[PDB]
Structure 1
Amino acid sequence: AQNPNCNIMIFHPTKEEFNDFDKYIAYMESQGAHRAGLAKIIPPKEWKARETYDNISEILIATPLQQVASGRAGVFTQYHKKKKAMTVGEYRHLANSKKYQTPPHQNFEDLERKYWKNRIYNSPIYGADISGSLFDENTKQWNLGHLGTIQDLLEKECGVVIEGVNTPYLYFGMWKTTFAWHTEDMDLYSINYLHLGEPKTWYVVPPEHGQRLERLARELFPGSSRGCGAFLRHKVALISPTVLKENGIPFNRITQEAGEFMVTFPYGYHAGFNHGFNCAEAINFATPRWIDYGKMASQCSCGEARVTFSMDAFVRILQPERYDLWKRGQD
């Protein structure tokens, strides 16, 4: 069995290997990459996403989100307070202001220490989930707006034709902006490209050990767990590496830098934070190996998780017994 310790693997495809996206995902899995829940892919030196980022300041962040924490430094939830619209140029200036800018630090490890010590005492503002793309239309390799769709994968594997679409999303971050512990909708894959700016640190639990994280989360967030049998789908809970280690939860960590891709694998729980002003693009995708995870994915039916239009068909076809309850939670 490849990668039995479930380490995060880093890949350096050649320009030739970068042509066929599906084939390369399958290659990484042949080497055991999925066992970690997360892999890094460094593009060949010949590749670029677009020519320059000199022209992005006019993108609008219609609903910036202030991420307000509650709890203790290592075990907390966050809620999102909506703020007035601003441009990417305005948001960049805000990220670089004395109130929000990255503190002086020695290295990524010192900054990680500072994040976990101090995160709860600040409320950083995140531009999340903005439909759009920064890949040039002429970029043919690993262009996240030109991937094969999840609807087409489901049709190819299962024969059924369904409604829905699958487009990318932009994320604008600042110091301490946080992504809570989660798997993807329907335990899909994700791919994330860091277009520009400061790094993103990731934490991940191997898929084979995801239920260990769920059981700890129920213990640590006991009111939330009574409210909903899949409350991690709410995407509000944070648990630090120190607390994970105290409780024996297997996990790994890695820092993504500008120009790098990360792939999350089905049922790979992940969380993390941004080091400073940055911009990422991400989208969900599927392969044949996903279908069994989609059929078994948990679902939130309490009303909180609320998701895209396109998840309806996935539930309806893969999880018909759960469909009526889940759709009530949508309505």
Structure 2
Amino acid sequence: AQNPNCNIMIFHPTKEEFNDFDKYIAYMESQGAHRAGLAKIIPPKEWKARETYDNISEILIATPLQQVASGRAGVFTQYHKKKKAMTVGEYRHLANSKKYQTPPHQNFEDLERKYWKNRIYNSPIYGADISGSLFDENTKQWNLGHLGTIQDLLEKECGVVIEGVNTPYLYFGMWKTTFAWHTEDMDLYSINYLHLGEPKTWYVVPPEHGQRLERLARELFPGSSRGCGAFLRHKVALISPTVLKENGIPFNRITQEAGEFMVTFPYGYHAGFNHGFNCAEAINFATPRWIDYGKMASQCSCGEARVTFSMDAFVRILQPERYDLWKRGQD
């Protein structure tokens, strides 16, 4: 069995190996990369996402989100307070201001320590979930806006055409901006490209151990768990590495830098934080191996999670017994 300890693997495809996305995902899996829940992919040196990042300041962040924490330093929830619109140029200035800028630090480990000690005492502002792309149209390899759609994958595997579209999203971050513990909608894959700026630290639980994380989360967030049997779908809970280690939860950590891709695998729980001003682009995708995970994915039916349009068809076709309850939660 490849990668039996579920370590995060790092890949260096050549330019020839970068031509066929599906084939390279399957190759990574042949080496056991999915067992970690997360892999890093460093593009060939011949490749670029676009020419420059000099022309992005006029992009609008219509609804910046202030991430306000409740709890204790290692075990907290965050809610998102909506703020007034601002451009990427305005947000970058904000991120670099004394109130929000990254503190002095020695190395990624020192910064990690400072994050976990101090995050709850501040409320950073995140430009998350902005529909759009920064890949140039003439980038032909690993262009996140030109991947095969999940609706086409389901159709090719199962035979049924479905409605819906699949497009990328941009994330503009600052120091301490946080992504809570989650798997993807319908336990899909995701791919995430860090276009520019400061790093992004990731934590991940192997898919084969995901239920251990869920059981700890129920223990640590007992009111949230009573409210919803899939409350991690709400994407609000944070648990630190120290608390995970105290509770024997298998996990790994890695830091992504500008110019690097990360792939999350079906049912790989992940969480993390940004080091400073940065911009990432992400999208979900599927392969034939995903179908069996989509049929078994949990769902939030309590009202909170409120998802995209395009999940309807995936629940309807893959999970017909759950569909009527799920849709009641959507309304």
Q: Same fold (TM over 0.5)?
A: yes
Instruction: Name the SS for the 1:296 alignment partner.
Output: coil
Deviation at 1:82, TM superposition (A): 0.1
Deviation at 1:107, TM superposition (A): 0.3
Deviation at 1:194, TM superposition (A): 0.1
Question: C-alpha deviations, 1:122-156, integer Å up to 9, x for none?
Answer: 00000000000000000000000000000000000
Deviation at 1:290, TM superposition (A): 0.1
Deviation at 1:266, TM superposition (A): 0.1
Partner Cα distance (1:170, 1:329) in 2: 27
Partner Cα distance (1:228, 1:17) in 2: 43
Deviation at 1:112, TM superposition (A): 0.2
Partner Cα distance (2:220, 2:326) in 1: 25
Partner Cα distance (1:121, 1:12) in 2: 39
Partner Cα distance (1:160, 1:305) in 2: 27
Pairwise mapping of residues 296-315 of structure 1 onto structure 2 (< 5 A)? 296-315=296-315
Instruction: Name the SS for the 2:215 alignment partner.
Output: helix
Instruction: Name the SS for the 2:193 alignment partner.
Output: strand
Partner Cα distance (1:145, 1:17) in 2: 19
Determine if the alignment matches structure 1 residue 328 to structure 2 residue 328: yes
Question: C-alpha deviations, 1:269-298, integer Å up to 9, x for none?
Answer: 000000000000000000000000000000
Partner Cα distance (1:125, 1:199) in 2: 16
Deviation at 1:224, TM superposition (A): 0.3
Question: C-alpha deviations, 1:212-265, integer Å up to 9, x for none?
Answer: 000000000000000000000000000000000000000000000000000000
Question: C-alpha deviations, 1:80-128, integer Å up to 9, x for none?
Answer: 0000000000000000000000000000000000000000000000000
Q: Give the root-mean-square deviation of aligned CA atoms.
A: 0.2
Partner Cα distance (2:230, 2:292) in 1: 19
Give the corresponding residue for 2:136: 136
Deviation at 1:23, TM superposition (A): 0.2
Uncovered stretches (5+) of structure 1, i.e. residues with no partner: none
Runs of 4 or more, structure 1, over 2 Å off, are none
Deviation at 1:175, TM superposition (A): 0.1
Partner Cα distance (1:276, 1:161) in 2: 42
Partner Cα distance (1:155, 1:229) in 2: 30
Uncovered stretches (5+) of structure 2, i.e. residues with no partner: none
Partner Cα distance (2:306, 2:127) in 1: 19
Deviation at 1:308, TM superposition (A): 0.3
Deviation at 1:59, TM superposition (A): 0.1
Instruction: Name the SS for the 2:287 alignment partner.
Output: coil
Instruction: Name the SS for the 1:70 alignment partner.
Output: strand
- Give me the TM-score of the superposition, normalised by structure 2: 1.00
Give the corresponding residue for 1:68: 68
Deviation at 1:63, TM superposition (A): 0.1
Instruction: Name the SS for the 1:309 alignment partner.
Output: coil
Deviation at 1:5, TM superposition (A): 0.1
Partner Cα distance (2:128, 2:102) in 1: 19
Give the corresponding residue for 2:154: 154
Deviation at 1:56, TM superposition (A): 0.1
Instruction: Name the SS for the 1:115 alignment partner.
Output: helix
**Percent identity over paired residues:** 100
Partner Cα distance (1:204, 1:34) in 2: 11
Deviation at 1:176, TM superposition (A): 0.1
Question: C-alpha deviations, 1:60-86, integer Å up to 9, x for none?
Answer: 000000000000000000000000000
Partner Cα distance (1:116, 1:285) in 2: 31
Question: C-alpha deviations, 1:187-217, integer Å up to 9, x for none?
Answer: 0000000000000000000000000000000
Deviation at 1:24, TM superposition (A): 0.1
Instruction: Name the SS for the 2:98 alignment partner.
Output: coil
Partner Cα distance (1:170, 1:148) in 2: 19
- Give me the TM-score of the superposition, normalised by structure 1: 1.00
Instruction: Name the SS for the 2:295 alignment partner.
Output: helix
